[PDB]
Coordinates of C-alpha atoms and ligand atoms in Angstrom, one line a residue:
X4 CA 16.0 0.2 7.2
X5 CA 15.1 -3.2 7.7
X6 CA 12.0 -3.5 9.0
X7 CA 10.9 -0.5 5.8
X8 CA 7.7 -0.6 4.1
X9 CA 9.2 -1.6 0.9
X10 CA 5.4 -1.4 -0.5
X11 CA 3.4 -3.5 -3.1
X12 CA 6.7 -5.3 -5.2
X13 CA 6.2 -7.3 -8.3
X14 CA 2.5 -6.6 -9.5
X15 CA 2.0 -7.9 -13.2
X16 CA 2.8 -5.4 -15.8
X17 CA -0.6 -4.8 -17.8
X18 CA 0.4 -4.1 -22.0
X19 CA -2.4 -1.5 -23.7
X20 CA -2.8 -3.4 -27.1
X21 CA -1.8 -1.4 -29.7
X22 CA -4.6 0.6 -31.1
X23 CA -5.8 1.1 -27.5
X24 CA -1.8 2.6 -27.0
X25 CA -2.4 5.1 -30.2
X26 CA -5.2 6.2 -28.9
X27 CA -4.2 7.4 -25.7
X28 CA -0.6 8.3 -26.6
X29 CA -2.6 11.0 -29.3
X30 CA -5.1 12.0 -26.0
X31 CA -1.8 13.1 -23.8
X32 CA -0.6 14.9 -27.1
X33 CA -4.3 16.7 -27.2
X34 CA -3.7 17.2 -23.2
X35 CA -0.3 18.8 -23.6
X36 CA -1.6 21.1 -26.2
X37 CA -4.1 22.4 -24.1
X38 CA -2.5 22.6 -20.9
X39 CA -0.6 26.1 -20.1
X40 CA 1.3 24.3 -17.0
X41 CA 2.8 20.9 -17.6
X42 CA 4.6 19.3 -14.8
X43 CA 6.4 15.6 -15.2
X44 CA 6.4 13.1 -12.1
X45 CA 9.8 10.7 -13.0
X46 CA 10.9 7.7 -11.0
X47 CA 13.0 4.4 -11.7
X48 CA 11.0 3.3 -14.8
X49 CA 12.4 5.9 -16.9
X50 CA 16.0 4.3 -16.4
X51 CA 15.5 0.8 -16.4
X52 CA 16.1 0.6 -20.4
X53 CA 19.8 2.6 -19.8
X54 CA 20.0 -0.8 -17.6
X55 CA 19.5 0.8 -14.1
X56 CA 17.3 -1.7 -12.4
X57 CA 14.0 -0.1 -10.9
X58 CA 12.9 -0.7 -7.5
X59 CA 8.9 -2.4 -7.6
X60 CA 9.4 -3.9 -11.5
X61 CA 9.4 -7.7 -12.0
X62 CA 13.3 -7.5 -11.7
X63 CA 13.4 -4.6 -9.5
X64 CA 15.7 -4.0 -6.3
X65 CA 12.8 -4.7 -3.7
X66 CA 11.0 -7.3 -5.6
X67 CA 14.2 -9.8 -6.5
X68 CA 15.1 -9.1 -2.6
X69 CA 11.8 -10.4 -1.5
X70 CA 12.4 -13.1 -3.8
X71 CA 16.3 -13.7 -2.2
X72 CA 17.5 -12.9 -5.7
X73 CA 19.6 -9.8 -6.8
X74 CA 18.9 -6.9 -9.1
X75 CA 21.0 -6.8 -12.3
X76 CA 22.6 -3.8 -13.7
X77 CA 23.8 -3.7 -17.2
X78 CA 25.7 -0.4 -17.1
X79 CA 27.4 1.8 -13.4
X80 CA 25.6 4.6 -13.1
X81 CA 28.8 6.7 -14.2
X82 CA 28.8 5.0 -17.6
X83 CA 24.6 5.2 -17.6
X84 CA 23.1 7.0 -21.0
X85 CA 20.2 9.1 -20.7
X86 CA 17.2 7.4 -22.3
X87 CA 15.0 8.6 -25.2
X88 CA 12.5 9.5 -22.4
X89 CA 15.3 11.5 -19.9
X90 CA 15.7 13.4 -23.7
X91 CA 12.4 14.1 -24.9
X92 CA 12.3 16.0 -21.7
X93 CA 15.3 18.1 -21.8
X94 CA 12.8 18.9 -25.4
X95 CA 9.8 19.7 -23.7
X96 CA 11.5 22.3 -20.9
X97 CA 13.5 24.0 -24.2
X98 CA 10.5 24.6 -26.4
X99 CA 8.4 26.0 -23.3
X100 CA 5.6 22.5 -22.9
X101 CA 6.9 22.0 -19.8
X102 CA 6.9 23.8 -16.5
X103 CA 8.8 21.8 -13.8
X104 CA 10.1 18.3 -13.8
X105 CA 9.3 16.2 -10.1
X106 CA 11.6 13.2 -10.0
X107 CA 12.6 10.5 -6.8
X108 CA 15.3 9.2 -9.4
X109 CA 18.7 9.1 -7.6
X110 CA 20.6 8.2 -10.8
X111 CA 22.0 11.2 -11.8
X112 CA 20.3 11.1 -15.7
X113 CA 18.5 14.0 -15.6
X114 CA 21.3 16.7 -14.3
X115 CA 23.9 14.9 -17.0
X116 CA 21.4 14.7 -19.7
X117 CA 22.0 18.9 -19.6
X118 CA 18.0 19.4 -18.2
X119 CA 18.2 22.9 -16.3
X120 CA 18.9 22.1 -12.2
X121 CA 16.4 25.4 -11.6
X122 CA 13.2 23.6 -13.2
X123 CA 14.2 20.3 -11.6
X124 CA 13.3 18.8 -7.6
X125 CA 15.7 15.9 -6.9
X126 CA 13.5 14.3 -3.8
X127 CA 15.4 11.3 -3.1
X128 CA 18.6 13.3 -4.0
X129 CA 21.2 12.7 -6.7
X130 CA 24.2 10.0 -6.2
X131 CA 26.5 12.3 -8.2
X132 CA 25.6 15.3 -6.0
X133 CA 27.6 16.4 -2.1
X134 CA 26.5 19.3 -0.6
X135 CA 29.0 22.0 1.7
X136 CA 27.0 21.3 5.8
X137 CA 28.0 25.1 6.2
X138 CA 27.3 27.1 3.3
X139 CA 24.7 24.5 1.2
X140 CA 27.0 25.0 -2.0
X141 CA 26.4 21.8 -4.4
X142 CA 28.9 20.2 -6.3
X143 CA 27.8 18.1 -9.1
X144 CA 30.5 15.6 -9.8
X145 CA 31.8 13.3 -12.8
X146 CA 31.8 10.4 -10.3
X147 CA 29.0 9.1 -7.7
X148 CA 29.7 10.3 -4.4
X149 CA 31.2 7.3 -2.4
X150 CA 28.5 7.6 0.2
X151 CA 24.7 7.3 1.0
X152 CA 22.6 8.6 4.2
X153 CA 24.1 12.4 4.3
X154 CA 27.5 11.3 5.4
X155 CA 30.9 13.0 5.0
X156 CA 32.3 12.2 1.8
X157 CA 35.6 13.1 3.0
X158 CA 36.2 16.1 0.8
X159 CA 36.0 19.9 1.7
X160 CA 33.9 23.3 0.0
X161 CA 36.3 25.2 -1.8
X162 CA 34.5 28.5 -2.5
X163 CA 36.1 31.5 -2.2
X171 CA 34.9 27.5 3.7
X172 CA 36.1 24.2 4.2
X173 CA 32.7 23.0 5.2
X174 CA 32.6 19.0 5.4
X175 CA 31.2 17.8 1.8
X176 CA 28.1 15.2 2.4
X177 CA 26.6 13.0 -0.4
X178 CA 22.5 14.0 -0.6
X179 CA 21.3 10.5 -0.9
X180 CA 18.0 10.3 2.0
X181 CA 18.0 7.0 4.3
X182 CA 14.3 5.7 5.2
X183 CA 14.4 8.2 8.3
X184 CA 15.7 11.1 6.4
X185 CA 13.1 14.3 5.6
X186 CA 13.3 15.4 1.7
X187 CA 14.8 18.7 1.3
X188 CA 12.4 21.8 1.8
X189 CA 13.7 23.2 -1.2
X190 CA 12.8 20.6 -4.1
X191 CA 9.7 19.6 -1.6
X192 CA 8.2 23.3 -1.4
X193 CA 9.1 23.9 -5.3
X194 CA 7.8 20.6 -6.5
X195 CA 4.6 21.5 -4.1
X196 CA 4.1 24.6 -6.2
X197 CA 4.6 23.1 -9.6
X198 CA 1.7 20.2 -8.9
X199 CA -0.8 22.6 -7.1
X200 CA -0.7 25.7 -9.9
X201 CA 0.0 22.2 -12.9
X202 CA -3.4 21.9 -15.2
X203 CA -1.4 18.7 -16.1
X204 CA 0.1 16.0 -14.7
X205 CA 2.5 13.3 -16.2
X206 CA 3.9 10.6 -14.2
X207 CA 6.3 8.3 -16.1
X208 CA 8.1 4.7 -14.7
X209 CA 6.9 5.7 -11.0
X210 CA 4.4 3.2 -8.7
X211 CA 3.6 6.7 -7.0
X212 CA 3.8 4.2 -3.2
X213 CA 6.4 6.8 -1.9
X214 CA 5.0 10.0 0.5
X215 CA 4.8 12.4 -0.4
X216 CA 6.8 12.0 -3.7
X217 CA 3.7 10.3 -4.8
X218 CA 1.5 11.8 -3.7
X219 CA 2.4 15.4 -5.7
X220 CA 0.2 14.6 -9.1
X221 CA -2.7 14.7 -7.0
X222 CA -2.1 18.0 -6.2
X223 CA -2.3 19.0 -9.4
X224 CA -6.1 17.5 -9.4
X225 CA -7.0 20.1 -7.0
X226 CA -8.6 23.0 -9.2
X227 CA -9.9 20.8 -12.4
X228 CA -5.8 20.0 -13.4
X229 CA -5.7 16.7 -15.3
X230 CA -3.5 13.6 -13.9
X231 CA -2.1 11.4 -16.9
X232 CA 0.1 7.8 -15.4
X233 CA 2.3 6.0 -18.2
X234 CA 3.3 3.0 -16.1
X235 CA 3.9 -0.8 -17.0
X236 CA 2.5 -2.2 -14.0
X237 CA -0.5 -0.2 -11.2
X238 CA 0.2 2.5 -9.1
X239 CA -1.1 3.7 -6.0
X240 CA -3.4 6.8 -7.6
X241 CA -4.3 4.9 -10.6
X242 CA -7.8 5.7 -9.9
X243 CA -7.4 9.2 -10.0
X244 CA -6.1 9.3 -13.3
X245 CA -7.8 10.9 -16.5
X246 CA -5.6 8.8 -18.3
X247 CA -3.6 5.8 -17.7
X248 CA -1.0 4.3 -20.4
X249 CA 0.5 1.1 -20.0
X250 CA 3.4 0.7 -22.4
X251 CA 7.3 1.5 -22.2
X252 CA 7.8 5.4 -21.3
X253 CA 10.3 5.7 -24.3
X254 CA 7.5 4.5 -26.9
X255 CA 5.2 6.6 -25.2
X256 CA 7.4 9.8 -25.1
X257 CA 8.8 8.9 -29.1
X258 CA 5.0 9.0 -30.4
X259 CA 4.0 11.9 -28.1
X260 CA 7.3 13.8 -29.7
X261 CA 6.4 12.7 -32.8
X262 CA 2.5 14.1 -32.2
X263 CA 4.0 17.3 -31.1
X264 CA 6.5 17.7 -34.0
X265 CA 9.7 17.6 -31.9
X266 CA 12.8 15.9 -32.2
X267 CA 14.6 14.3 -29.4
X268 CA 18.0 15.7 -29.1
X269 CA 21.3 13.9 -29.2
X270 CA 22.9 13.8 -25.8
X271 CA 27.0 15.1 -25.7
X272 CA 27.7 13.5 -22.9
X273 CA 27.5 14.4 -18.8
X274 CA 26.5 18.1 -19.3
X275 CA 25.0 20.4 -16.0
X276 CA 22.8 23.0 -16.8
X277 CA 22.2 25.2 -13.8
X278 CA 19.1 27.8 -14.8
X279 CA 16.6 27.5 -18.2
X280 CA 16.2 29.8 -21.1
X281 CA 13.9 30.8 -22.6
X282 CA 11.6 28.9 -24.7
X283 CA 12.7 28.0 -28.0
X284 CA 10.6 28.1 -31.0
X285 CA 7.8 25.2 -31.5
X286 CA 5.4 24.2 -33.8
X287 CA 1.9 25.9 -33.8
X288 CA -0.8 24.4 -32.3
X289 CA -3.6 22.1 -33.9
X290 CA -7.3 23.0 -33.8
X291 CA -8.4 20.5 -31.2
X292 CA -12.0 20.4 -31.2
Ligands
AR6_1 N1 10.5 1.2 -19.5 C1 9.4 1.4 -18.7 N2 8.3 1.9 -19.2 C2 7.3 2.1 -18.4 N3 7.2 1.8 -17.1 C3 8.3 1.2 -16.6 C4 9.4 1.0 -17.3 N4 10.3 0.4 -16.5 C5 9.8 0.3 -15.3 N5 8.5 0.8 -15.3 C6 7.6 0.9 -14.2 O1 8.2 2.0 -13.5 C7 7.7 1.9 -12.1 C8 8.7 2.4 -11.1 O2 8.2 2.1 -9.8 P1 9.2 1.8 -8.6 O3 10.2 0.8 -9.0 O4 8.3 1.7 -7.4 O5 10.1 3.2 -8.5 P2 9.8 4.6 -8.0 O6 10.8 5.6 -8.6 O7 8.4 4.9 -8.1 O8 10.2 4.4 -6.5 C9 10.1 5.5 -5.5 C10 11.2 5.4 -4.5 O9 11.1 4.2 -3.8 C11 12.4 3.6 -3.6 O10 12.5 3.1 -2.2 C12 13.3 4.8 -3.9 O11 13.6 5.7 -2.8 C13 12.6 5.5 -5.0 O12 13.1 6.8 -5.3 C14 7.3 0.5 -11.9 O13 6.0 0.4 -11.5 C15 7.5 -0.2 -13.2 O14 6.3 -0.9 -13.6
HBD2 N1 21.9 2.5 -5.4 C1 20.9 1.6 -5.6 O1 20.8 0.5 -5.0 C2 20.0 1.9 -6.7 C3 19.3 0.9 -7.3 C4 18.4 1.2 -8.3 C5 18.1 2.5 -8.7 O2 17.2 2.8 -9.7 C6 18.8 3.6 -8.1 C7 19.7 3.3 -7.1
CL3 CL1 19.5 0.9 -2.4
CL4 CL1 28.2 2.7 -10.6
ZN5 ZN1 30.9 25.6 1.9

């Protein structure tokens, strides 16, 4: 816990000037269009403007803690509002442009922004989340579970078992669960694209799951402020803030971003809604 590779912390953020940003924001729409399997990779950097601090960022958990300062949160995580990006991507899954959604956020946003549980791997799990030791039911609650590490959260399963309630947050030792693992592991391998949005991609094997999609000709794009670990791999890197990213790309695509009603759980997807037709690309 201590002694954890905390990773590379506090690398400058790089800002694509503007026309450069365009450019490439109209490239990933062009991508999306002509992918048939689109699989998002989220991480802190997708929350960090719904004032959850990231982790790596200038102002992030590890960083300031190398730096014997503290990370700042301007909202609880209860009281935490889905951002643009968390909604654009509740969009994407409804109208059919994207497959599965890979995230190592622990913060809750994407179950309570109403994005279907059955197209989603929580790696890192989710703070709102306990899980029944005996019979594996979930329970997504209104609150964050008091506890971190798998423990007891002191309450009891109440289907139709009594099995001790533990929260689903990982420690440092802590294997990710086979489920969202193998799932996420088969929506990056069969992916012909790629996005990774707010993650450094440091984390195995969390981070290492876009490659995957390389495998077989699939096409990696990174929106990131600052490096990542598989920048190199990338067809396409954009550095700029995820939600001006995903606002233009919605824009490109002809979709709005939906108003959020509040905490909403949404256990299995429907079918695809209706969506624009497609341009002529080349
Ligand atoms: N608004 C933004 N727009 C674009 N990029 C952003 C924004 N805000 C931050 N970033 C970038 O977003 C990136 C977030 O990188 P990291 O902070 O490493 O978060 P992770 O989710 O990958 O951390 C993985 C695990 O590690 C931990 O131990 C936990 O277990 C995590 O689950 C940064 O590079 C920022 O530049
Ligand atoms: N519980 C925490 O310390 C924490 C911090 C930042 C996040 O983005 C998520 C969780
Ligand atoms: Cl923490
Ligand atoms: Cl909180
Ligand atoms: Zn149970």
């Amino acid at each position: 816990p201590f002694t954890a590779d905390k990773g590379k912390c506090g690398l400058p953020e790089i800002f694509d000037p503007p026309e450069e940003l365009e450019r490439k924001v109209w490239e990933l729409a062009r991508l999306v269009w002509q992918s048939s399997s689109v699989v998002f990779h989220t991480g802190a950097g997708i929350s960090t403007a719904s004032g959850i601090p990231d982790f790596r960022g200038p102002h992030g958990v590890w960083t300031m803690e190398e730096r014997g300062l503290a990370p700042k949160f301007d909202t609880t995580f209860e009281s935490a509002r889905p951002t643009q990006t968390h909604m654009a991507l509740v969009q994407l899954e409804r109208v059919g442009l994207l497959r599965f959604l890979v995230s190592q956020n622990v913060d809750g946003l994407h179950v309570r922004s109403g994005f279907p549980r059955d197209k989603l791997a929580e790696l890192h799990g989710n703070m709102f989340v306990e899980e029944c030791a005996k019979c594996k039911t979930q329970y997504v609650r209104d609150t964050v579970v008091g506890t971190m590490g798998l423990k007891a959260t002191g309450r009891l399963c109440t289907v139709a078992c009594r099995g001790e309630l533990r929260d689903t947050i990982l420690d440092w030792e802590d294997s990710l669960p086979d489920r969202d693992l193998a799932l996420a592991d088969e929506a990056s391998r069969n992916a012909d694209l790629s996005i990774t949005l707010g993650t450094s991609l440091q984390i195995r094997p969390s981070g290492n799951l876009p490659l995957a999609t390389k495998r077989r000709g699939g096409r990696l794009v990174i929106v990131n402020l600052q490096p990542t670990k598989h920048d190199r791999h990338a067809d396409l890197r954009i550095h700029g803030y995820v939600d001006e990213v995903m606002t233009r790309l919605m824009k490109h695509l002809g979709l709005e971003i939906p108003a959020w009603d509040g905490p909403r759980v949404l256990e299995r997807a429907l079918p695809p809604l209706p969506r624009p037709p497609t341009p002529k690309l080349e």
